Amino acid sequence: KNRAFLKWAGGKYPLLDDIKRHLPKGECLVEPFVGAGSVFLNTDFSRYILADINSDLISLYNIVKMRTDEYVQAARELFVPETNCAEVYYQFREEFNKSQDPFRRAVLFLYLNRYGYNGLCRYNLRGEFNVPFGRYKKPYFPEAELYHFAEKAQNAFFYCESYADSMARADDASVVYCDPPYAPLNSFTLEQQAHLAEIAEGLVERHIPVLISNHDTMLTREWYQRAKLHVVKVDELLALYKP
Amino acid sequence: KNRAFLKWAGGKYPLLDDIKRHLPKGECLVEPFVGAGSVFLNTDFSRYILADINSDLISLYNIVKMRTDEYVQAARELFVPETNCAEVYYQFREEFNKSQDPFRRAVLFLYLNRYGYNGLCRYNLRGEFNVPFGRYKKPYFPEAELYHFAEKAQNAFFYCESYADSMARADDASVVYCDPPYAPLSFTLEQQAHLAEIAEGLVERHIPVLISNHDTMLTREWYQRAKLHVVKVKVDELLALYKP
Amino acid sequence: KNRAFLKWAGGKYPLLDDIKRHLPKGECLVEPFVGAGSVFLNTDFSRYILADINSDLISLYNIVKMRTDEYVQAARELFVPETNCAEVYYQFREEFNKSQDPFRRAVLFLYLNRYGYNGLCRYNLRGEFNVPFGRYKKPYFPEAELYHFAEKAQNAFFYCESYADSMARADDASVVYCDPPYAPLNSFTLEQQAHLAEIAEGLVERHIPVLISNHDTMLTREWYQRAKLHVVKVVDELLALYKP
Ligand SMILES: Nc1ncnc2c1ncn2[C@@H]1O[C@H](CN(CCc2csc3ccccc23)CC[C@H](N)C(=O)O)[C@@H](O)[C@H]1O
Ligand SMILES: Nc1ncnc2c1ncn2[C@@H]1O[C@H](CN(CCc2csc3ccccc23)CC[C@H](N)C(=O)O)[C@@H](O)[C@H]1O
Ligand SMILES: Nc1ncnc2c1ncn2[C@@H]1O[C@H](CN(CCc2csc3ccccc23)CC[C@H](N)C(=O)O)[C@@H](O)[C@H]1O
């Protein structure tokens, strides 16, 4: 179980076995919600398309892919112990919210993922990153995970796009793995939630497989109704669209 | 302890003992919120007036009562192995929503309540039956309970109307039992209190009423004027007796 | 440990220890949200300024300060067995909502807090007190706590104003302790909650120490980012101290 350099909080690695049980083989895996990368990091496709709306994430990812050593070194500096108090965190939050340089921002992004309350990633209405200090014991610099991610990223393209656009890049050689924000028990709406399904139906008819993960509820069974459904242990659901 | 042919609200009928404990005697039992029918099914008044606002329900019950053998036969057909899969479940749900045949609707309805997610009854904004496939091991066709219902229905009338109208059918020899939709932790709080206000009117005319709900500040507020009884278990449940 | 004479649903008491551990020393302790009085009852300042938005409360307190026995006498009369029923509760409550006499009102207020659902203080939108009968097996008359409250009162001023006014009164020799309505998961707002933390910034900046207590949250940590913070497990409580 290769870990992700980022917290989500990470988040977790349940389901992983089950996702791989039902994930069908192919050349290229297309992920319209990469998030922390956990599935990508734990699979062996020849080739990966990975997308997400959060541009801070994609930008980090391309940098880790293209400038690995220079990235690791600049990031490492600010895991020294002088930077582990409320006074520094807030100064670094502000710098990040005011920076226009993508590189510097990716370095600071890392530190905030690791020193901030529960590894949350959150913006206020002015679109500033607005998570407070976590008061963490001893954070951990993820040097190995960084390198491991960048080796793997050499067969990965990353795009800042929403699900319909990333989903439109699959072809017959592709498989598609979907991890939308969870159905309920701004944000991602139910209209979008049902829209993802239709896209899935559109793709499977074109002979491209699609697997979707979500809570098990009334709404999701409605949405995923034209798919093979496996329940797993609230319960999770894995909707498979096999041609 | 007789069961209802329809899968109930959540899981109920452990309250039946406290209901029968606190339910006064008389000739007729009026039930403004009949639902699946279990108080009716496990009680013994000489007649019943049974009401509900869902007209799929009241139709079904009028057809179980008046066309009993033809209904049971036709329904049993649908409870096979062939029909226990999404493909068919969805096909039958669409038929139901498109149909104009009260008979055939009553049929599909039971299948949908048996093969459907948590045996729920729900409609979307367009008024169409809305519950997804329930993925059950193998569903049980309620043959005995269908007949029990039908035999018991011979002393019943079914109405499709609202708590206020059904409650005004009650009279000197009546007794009212209400089982409104649950208070919170759509049926509005204004109606929730209206129900307790009509109860207060009934008892002034010497017509006992008993009402059932969760135990909360609000239920307690609305039923101020009834002797109150708390039933444990997951939270407590309240029974409010208005007695002359 | 002294108890308040007023009931409350779920706390103030559990944390006194942790609080007194972190409460700075000084001559006067100021309390924007006095509530039931428990830190005030269990600390030993020279003088106290005690404040709350609820006029019924401050008024009750001023009356207990100045008319002790005349108060305790009238209040005892209502803790008899003849009163522990819904007939009487609703009667007393209605008299409270209709009385314009402070003294009669404050005697009733105590009946309502000890005989009502969960010791709760609520009002409808017409300002009427709307808590129902709490159906209590037997309610205590807190005589000892009343007298103890009166005794300490001699070193206190009660004000009915809002958090900012009452904090504007703190001075070189003061300590402020804040216990706002809790952060979430016509009431106290987020903006207000963030405003309290600012006034606190201003106060420490003038060498006035401030202690605030709340749940441990993403939100409470944002607001109190400038305080020295201490989690206390029991979700967790947060204590934020602004020390010069
Ligand atoms: N409209 C959208 N199109 C494409 N991607 C979208 C869209 N809306 C939201 N997303 C992205 O979808 C991702 C959400 N994912 C994971 C988010 C995430 C995990 S670790 C991490 C670290 C940094 C940033 C985000 C994340 C949520 C799935 C999980 N089952 C849950 O409900 O919590 C997240 O990256 C978010 O940015
Ligand atoms: N204004 C109304 N007047 C009379 N009846 C009403 C009114 N509004 C709603 N109702 C009906 O009241 C019935 C409610 N029943 C709910 C049972 C139910 C839910 S889905 C279903 C399918 C078949 C049979 C019963 C049920 C009361 C039980 C309990 N208090 C609860 O809701 O948890 C239900 O049939 C609904 O259709
Ligand atoms: N804006 C305000 N300014 C001053 N005081 C305020 C303001 N807003 C609310 N308050 C007062 O703040 C008091 C808060 N206290 C209420 C304590 C109480 C105990 S017994 C009793 C009987 C009557 C009234 C209050 C209480 C609750 C804080 C807690 N952590 C929570 O949210 O549950 C409460 O009495 C309320 O009247």
Is the minimum CB–CB distance between C91 and chain B shorter than 8 Å?
A: no
Going by CA atoms, what residue is nearest to atom 15 of ligand 3? Answer: C35
How many contacts, defined by CB atoms under 8 Å, are there between A and B? Answer: 16
User: Which residues from C are below 8 Å from A86, CB to CB?
Assistant: 225
Rounded CA gap, C191 and C172, in Å?
A: 28
Query: By three-state DSSP, how is residue A3 classified?
Result: coil
**Which of B102, B134, B154 is a domain's end point?**
B154
Rounded CA gap, B219 and B221, in Å?
A: 5
CB atoms within 10 A of CB B18: 15
Same domain for C100 and C38? no
Where do we find the tokens 């020899």?
Answer: B173
In whole angstroms, how far apart are CA A177 and each of A47, A200, C193?
A: 13, 10, 43
Same domain for C4 and C42? yes
Same domain for A143 and A77? yes
Whether A102 contacts A63, CB under 8 Å: yes
Residue of C nearest to A133 (CA): C221
Rounded CA gap, C17 and B201, in Å?
A: 54
> In chain B, positions 111-140, which contact chain A (CB-CB < 8 Å)?
117, 120, 130-133, 135
Same domain for C164 and C129? no
Binding-site annotation: residue ranges of A for S-adenosyl-L-methionine: 8, 12, 52, 179
Same domain for C1 and C26? yes
Same domain for C67 and C188? no
**Alpha helices, H only, chain B:** 16-22, 38-41, 55-66, 68-76, 86-98, 102-115, 143-152, 163-167, 189-204, 217-222
Structure tokens at C60: 């009750």
**Strands lying side by side in the sheet with A156-159:** A156-159, A47-51, A28-31, A174-178, A210-215, A236-241, A228-232
Report strand pairing: B47-52 vs B227-231: unpaired
| Cis omega (within 30 of 0) for bond into A98 | no
Shortest CA gap A37–chain C (Å): 25
Please choose, from the candidates A8, A1, A15, A9, the residue with its C-alpha nearest in 3D space to the C-alpha of residue A236.
A15
Going by CA atoms, what residue is nearest to atom 1 of ligand 2? Answer: B162
Partner-chain residue, chosen from A218, A225, A231, that has the shortest CB–CB distance to B90 = A225
Where do we find the tokens 């992920």?
Answer: A31
Query: By three-state DSSP, how is residue B166 classified?
Result: helix
Whether C44 contacts C151, CB under 8 Å: no
Q: Label residue B189 exposed, middle or buried (CB < 10 Å: 0-12, 13-18, 19+).
A: exposed
Report strand pairing: B237-242 vs B209-214: antiparallel
Rounded CA gap, B137 and C139, in Å?
A: 53
Shortest CA gap B216–chain C (Å): 9
In whole angstroms, how far apart are CA B68 and each of A126, B36, B72, B76, B151?
A: 66, 17, 6, 12, 9
Do A132 and C225 lie within an 8 Å CB cutoff? yes
The sign one gets for the Cα dihedral B186, B188, B193, B198 is: negative
Whether B45 contacts B24, CB under 8 Å: no
Please choose, from the candidates C223, C146, C242, the residue with its C-alpha nearest in 3D space to the C-alpha of residue C180.
C223
Do C218 and A135 lie within an 8 Å CB cutoff? no
**Which of A154, A187, A202 is a domain's end point?**
A154
User: Which residues from A are below 8 Å from C229, CB to CB?
Assistant: 135
Domain total of chain B: 2
Rounded CA gap, C230 and C238, in Å?
A: 6
Going by CA atoms, what residue is nearest to atom 2 of ligand 1? Answer: A162
Question: Beta partners for B188?
Answer: none
Question: Beta partners for A238?
Answer: A213, A230
Same domain for B23 and B70? no
What burial letters (b/e) apply to A29-38, b meaning 16+ CB within 10 Å?
Answer: bbbbbbbbbb
Which regions of A99-188 does DSSP assign to beta strands (E)?
Answer: 156-159, 174-178
Rounded CA gap, C13 and B193, in Å?
A: 37
Ligand 3 centroid to C35 CA: how many Å? 5
Ligand nearest to the CA of B13: 2
Computed on alpha carbons and rounded to an integer, the radius of gyration of chain B in Å comes to: 19
Q: Provide the domain limits for residue B195.
A: 1-54+155-244
Rounded CA gap, A178 and A156, in Å?
A: 17
Structure tokens at A102: 């993508």
Whether A3 contacts A145, CB under 8 Å: yes
Rounded CA gap, B47 and B40, in Å?
A: 10
What burial letters (b/e) apply to A140-151, b meaning 16+ CB within 10 Å?
Answer: ebbeebbebbbe
Same domain for A62 and A27? no
Rounded CA gap, A85 and B111, in Å?
A: 63
User: Which residues from A are below 8 Å from B120, CB to CB?
Assistant: 218
- Enclosing H/E stretch for A163: helix A163-167
Rounded CA gap, C231 and A133, in Å?
A: 13
C43 Cα distance to chain centroid: 15
Same domain for B61 and B146? yes
Cβ neighbours of residue B124 under 8 Å, at least 6 residues apart?
B130
Question: Beta partners for A177?
Answer: A211
Same domain for B164 and B147? no
Where do we find the tokens 């209206």?
Answer: B194
Query: By three-state DSSP, how is residue C199 classified?
Result: helix
Ligand 3 centroid to C6 CA: how many Å? 12
Write the CATH number for B105: 1.10.1020.10
In whole angstroms, how far apart are CA A14 and each of A5, A18, A232, A239, B136?
A: 17, 8, 10, 16, 26
Question: Beta partners for B212?
Answer: B239
Write the CATH number for B39: 3.40.50.150
Say whether C236 counts as a known binding-site residue: no
Query: By three-state DSSP, how is residue C87 classified?
Result: helix
Please choose, from the candidates A193, A175, A176, the residue with its C-alpha nearest in 3D space to the C-alpha of residue A184.
A193
- Enclosing H/E stretch for A105: helix A102-115
- Enclosing H/E stretch for A166: helix A163-167
Whether B146 contacts B64, CB under 8 Å: yes
Cβ neighbours of residue B93 under 8 Å, at least 6 residues apart?
B108, B112, B129, B131
Report strand pairing: B209-214 vs B174-178: parallel
In whole angstroms, how far apart are CA B47 and each of B2, B28, B204?
A: 18, 5, 23
Same domain for B93 and B161? no
Structure tokens at C29: 């302790």
Same domain for A41 and A100? no
Q: Determine if residue B37 is left, alpha or beta; phi over 0 gives left, psi from -120 to 50 gives alpha, anything else beta.
A: left
Ligand 2 atom at minimal distance to the Cα of residue B36: 24
User: Which residues from A are below 8 Å from B135, CB to CB?
Assistant: 229, 231
Please choose, from the candidates C36, C10, C46, the residue with its C-alpha nearest in 3D space to the C-alpha of residue C175.
C46
Residue type for position B194:
H
Residue B54, ligand 2, Cβ within 6 A: yes
Under DSSP, the state recorded for B42 is: T
Report strand pairing: C237-242 vs C210-215: antiparallel
Ligand 1 centroid to A178 CA: how many Å? 10
| Cis omega (within 30 of 0) for bond into A9 | yes
**Which of B154, B172, B191 is a domain's end point?**
B154
Please choose, from the candidates B51, B7, B9, the residue with its C-alpha nearest in 3D space to the C-alpha of residue B177.
B51
Chains with ≥3 Cβ pairs under 8 A against B?
A, C
Rounded CA gap, A143 and C165, in Å?
A: 53
Cβ neighbours of residue B5 under 8 Å, at least 6 residues apart?
B36, B64, B110, B142, B145, B146, B148, B149
Do B86 and A225 lie within an 8 Å CB cutoff? yes
Is the minimum CB–CB distance between A144 and chain B shorter than 8 Å?
A: no
Whether A160 contacts A63, CB under 8 Å: no
Structure tokens at B220: 């307690």
Query: By three-state DSSP, how is residue C131 classified?
Result: coil
The sign one gets for the Cα dihedral A51, A55, A56, A61 is: positive
Whether B173 contacts B28, CB under 8 Å: yes
